[PDB]
Design goal:
The protein is an alpha+beta fold. Helix content is about 35%, strand content about 20%. It has a single domain (about 5-260), classed as 3-Layer(aba) Sandwich (Beta-lactamase), CATH 3.40.710.10. It has helices at about 5-15, 45-55, 95-105, 105-115, 120-130, 155-170, 175-185, 250-260; strands at about 20-25, 30-35, 40, 70, 90, 155, 205-210, 215-225, 230-240. α1 (about 5-15) packs antiparallel against α8, α2 (about 45-55) packs across α4 (about 105-115) and α2 packs across α5. It is an enzyme of class 3 (hydrolase).
């Protein structure tokens, strides 16, 4: 048990919940894992796979991001901060992807899932890029029920870190697509209290957060320190009480521990 793992375990013990961490240090290809093969509910971190899948479609359908998609009243779900602005109108697939990734818009995620043929089409893209662990089973909002022990809509911290690496640093997408995905993740508006809050302020970050029932609080990030090779960090957290409060501080603290542990 490494020093870093002792500090993560102590964090977890202080928190009352269950913590999952994976780091990939791309310089050494070194990894640090904490509960690294346990399943965790993904909640909105799954939007990264869905958006990536659509980007993969756009490598042959070249104007696909420009395609208008009607937003109907009946499309609206539980959390639609961008899409309620465009009801009885349209949004493009790039707009929908941005809304999903940068504001965690759930109606936008559902449009991405639809474009891929259902939750199975998202899982199909994960299997196509090598990830045998991720599984998306539901649409929003039910994918975030985060019920303890439920395998639906889960991944592991190990798998998700490998996937995020392959998507943002490793050629799973076309270079136009990848740089889109990076732009989007760097532009996330919902991550300031999560991984970003635990990292040196000179480091550039792209991230996607997630949140659900059972106080589920997640973040996945690609990290570029100035001076050294980038890192991928995945932090998942979930709690025993169905109505538990969010704990983005845990994710920040987990990130600080990994950053100080390099």
């Amino acid at each position: 048990t490494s020093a870093v793992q002792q500090k993560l375990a102590a964090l977890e013990k202080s928190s009352g919940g269950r913590l999952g961490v994976a780091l990939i240090d791309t310089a050494d290809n070194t990894q640090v894992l904490y509960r690294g093969d346990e399943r965790f509910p993904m909640c909105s971190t799954s939007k990264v796979m869905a958006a990536a899948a659509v980007l993969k479609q756009s490598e042959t359908q070249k104007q696909l991001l420009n395609q208008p998609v009607e937003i109907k009243p009946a499309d609206l779900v539980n959390y639609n901060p961008i899409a309620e602005k465009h009801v009885n109108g349209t949004m493009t697939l790039a707009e929908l992807s941005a809304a999903a990734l940068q504001y965690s818009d759930n109606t936008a995620m559902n449009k991405l899932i639809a474009q891929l043929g259902g939750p199975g089409g998202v899982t199909a893209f994960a299997r196509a890029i090598g990830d045998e662990t991720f599984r998306l089973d539901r649409t929003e909002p039910t994918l975030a029920t985060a019920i303890p022990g439920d395998p639906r809509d889960t991944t592991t911290p190990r798998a998700m870190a490998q996937t995020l690496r392959q998507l943002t640093l490793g050629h799973a997408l076309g270079e136009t697509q990848r740089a889109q995905l990076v732009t989007w993740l760097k532009g996330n508006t919902t991550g300031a209290a999560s991984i970003r809050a635990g990292l040196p302020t000179s480091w550039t970050v792209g991230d996607k957060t997630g949140s659900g029932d059972y106080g589920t609080t997640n973040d996945i990030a690609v990290i570029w320190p100035q001076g050294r090779a980038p890192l991928v960090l995945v932090t998942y957290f979930t709690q025993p009480q169905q109505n538990a409060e969010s704990r983005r501080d845990v994710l920040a603290s987990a990130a600080r521990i990994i950053a100080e542990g390099l």
